[PDB]
Ligand binder design. Structure first.
Ligand SMILES: COc1cc(-c2cc(C)nc(N)n2)c(Cl)cc1Cl
Length: 217
């Protein structure tokens, strides 16, 4: 008689990814705003991909033709969400690409930081997503790929993440990254702050970026 039942899988992060997450979430950096640039960059890449695929197969856009990025601060939940209508991910994609397999860039980036590089370089190593943990204590990724169901990935950087089917609100296609912000990082929920960060770092993104200020009445 339960309203809902669903299987949740828990996976351990590959060792080097766990190491990087611990470094990022614990260490003091003075330029934490770069997380938003990195997430918008990932969305832009995902939008390029579905767009590329649609060139040879227009039906790839039956799940939605609009290619855009939405930013949604919710002060009541203390969350900031970045949403795109890009290519999205399968369950295998989440497990493979968000924790269990480390590319060489993970170790390389930590090496670069030890050698004196700046965290703002993180995107060049292909792991910019994890910069989310500069400002977030927990990150949830909800994703929908063509021909696949909607999944939710989640981690609070304990060395493990979970994956499950998401049945809440169906997306047409794309990815939502939900940042559950640290208590002292709530400035990134303010309109002025989000606007100035986008203006400074995401000028050359070639998709509409739209702010939706969320408040439950
Ligand atoms: C390249 O690495 C990553 C990419 C993504 C991603 C994938 C897709 C399809 N879209 C968006 N916005 N982001 C994520 Cl959620 C984590 C990592 Cl680690």
């Amino acid at each position: 008689q339960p309203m809902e039942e669903e299987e949740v899988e828990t996976f351990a992060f590959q060792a080097e990814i766990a190491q990087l997450m611990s470094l990022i979430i614990n260490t003091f950096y003075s330029n934490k705003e770069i997380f938003l640039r990195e997430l918008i960059s990932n969305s832009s890449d995902a939008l390029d991909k579905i767009r590329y695929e649609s060139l040879t197969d227009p039906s790839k856009l039956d799940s939605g033709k609009e290619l855009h990025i939405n930013l949604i601060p919710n002060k009541q939940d203390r969350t900031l969400t970045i949403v795109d209508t890009g290519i999205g991910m399968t369950k295998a994609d989440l497990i493979n690409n968000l924790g269990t397999i480390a590319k060489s860039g993970t170790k390389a980036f930590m090496e670069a930081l030890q050698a004196g590089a700046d965290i703002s370089m993180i995107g060049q190593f292909g792991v910019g997503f994890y910069s989310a943990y500069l400002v977030a204590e927990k990150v949830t990724v909800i994703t929908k790929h063509n021909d696949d169901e909607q999944y939710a990935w989640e981690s609070s950087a304990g060395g493990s993440f979970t994956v499950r089917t998401d049945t809440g609100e169906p997306m047409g296609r794309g990815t939502k990254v939900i940042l559950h912000l640290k208590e002292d990082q709530t400035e990134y929920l303010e309109e002025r702050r989000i606007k100035e960060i986008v203006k400074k770092h995401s000028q050359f993104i070639g998709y509409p970026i739209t702010l939706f200020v969320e408040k439950e009445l």
